[PDB]
Amino acid sequence: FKDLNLTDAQKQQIREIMKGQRDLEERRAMHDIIASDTFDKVKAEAQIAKMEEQRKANMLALMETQNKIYNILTPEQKKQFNANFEKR
Amino acid sequence: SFKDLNLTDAQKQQIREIMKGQRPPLEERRAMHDIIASDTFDKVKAEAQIAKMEEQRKANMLALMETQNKIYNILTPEQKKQFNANFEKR
Ligand SMILES: [Cl-]
Ligand SMILES: [Cl-]
Ligand SMILES: [Zn+2]
Ligand SMILES: [Zn+2]
Ligand SMILES: [Zn+2]
Ligand SMILES: [Zn+2]
Ligand SMILES: [Zn+2]
Ligand SMILES: [Zn+2]
Ligand SMILES: [Zn+2]
Ligand SMILES: [Zn+2]
Ligand SMILES: [Zn+2]
Ligand SMILES: [Zn+2]
Ligand SMILES: [Zn+2]
């Protein structure tokens, strides 16, 4: 989703980008927490803390990728990127 | 799937109860927007931003997990089996 009228050079600069940072026993542990007879808060706090590490890595990847995408855009395309960002 | 499990009247009430007993952060998004729309990627400020709502995320996730555990446990074994099998597929 990118209604920015992007140039051929741009699309392929973008592929280059979504390849460095285009580069699950988590959901198993949460499954075990939900499906247990009893709710173990301390065990759930530790799962949340471990999820924080992957969220960190994922958010850093997303944001770095998006920052590089932004900084190949024209002033006009940047304004449009920013407006689009306010709505999704 | 996920939410269509042939809940009985009683289960419908019991879920109603649970969900009162455990009930969009724009300021967070604004700060993501400042990091993305800058002429450089500032990792140290990005890490600060990401970490900022840790405690609120903890409370919300703990509430969510306790709520889901409580609803799992009012299910019959056939419904638990359905829910678990769907869970593996997500
Ligand atoms: Cl799982
Ligand atoms: Cl924003
Ligand atoms: Zn599972
Ligand atoms: Zn324990
Ligand atoms: Zn990098
Ligand atoms: Zn009825
Ligand atoms: Zn506010
Ligand atoms: Zn914004
Ligand atoms: Zn700002
Ligand atoms: Zn500068
Ligand atoms: Zn912390
Ligand atoms: Zn804490
Ligand atoms: Zn409680």
Author numbering:
A (entry chain B): 29 to 51, 58 to 122
B (entry chain A): 28 to 50, 56 to 122
Task: Provide the authors' original text about this structure.
The Im7 peptides L18pI-Phe and K20pI-Phe crystallized in complex with Spy show a very different pattern compared with the multiple signals observed for L19pI-Phe. In both cases the peak heights in the phased anomalous difference Fourier maps were very strong: the iodine signals were detected at 26.4σ and 32.5σ for L18pI-Phe and K20pI-Phe, respectively. For K20pI-Phe, a second data set was collected below the iodine edge at 4.5 keV. Consistent with the L19pI-Phe data collections, the strength of the iodine anomalous signal detected is highly dependent on the crystal quality. This combination of measurements confirmed that K20pI-Phe produced detectable anomalous scattering from a single position in the crystal, providing an ideal case for determining the position of a partially occupied anomalous scatterer. Anomalous site refinements show that the occupancies of L18pI-Phe and K20pI-Phe are approximately 20% and 33%, with B factors of approximately 47 and 55 Å2, respectively. In the case of K20pI-Phe, a simultaneous fitting of the new L19pI-Phe and K20pI-Phe signals within 0.43 Å on average was possible. However, cross-validation tests in which the K20pI-Phe signal was held out did not back-predict the K20pI-Phe anomalous signal.
Spy is one of a group of chaperones that allow clients to fold while remaining continuously bound to the surface of the chaperone. We have previously observed that the chaperone substrate Im7 exists in a heterogeneous, largely disordered crystallographic ensemble while bound to the chaperone Spy. To refine strategies for detecting anomalous scattering for observing partially occupied disordered states, we co-crystallized the tight-binding Spy H96L variant with short peptides derived from its client, Im7. These peptides each had a single iodophenylalanine substitution at position 18, 19 or 20.
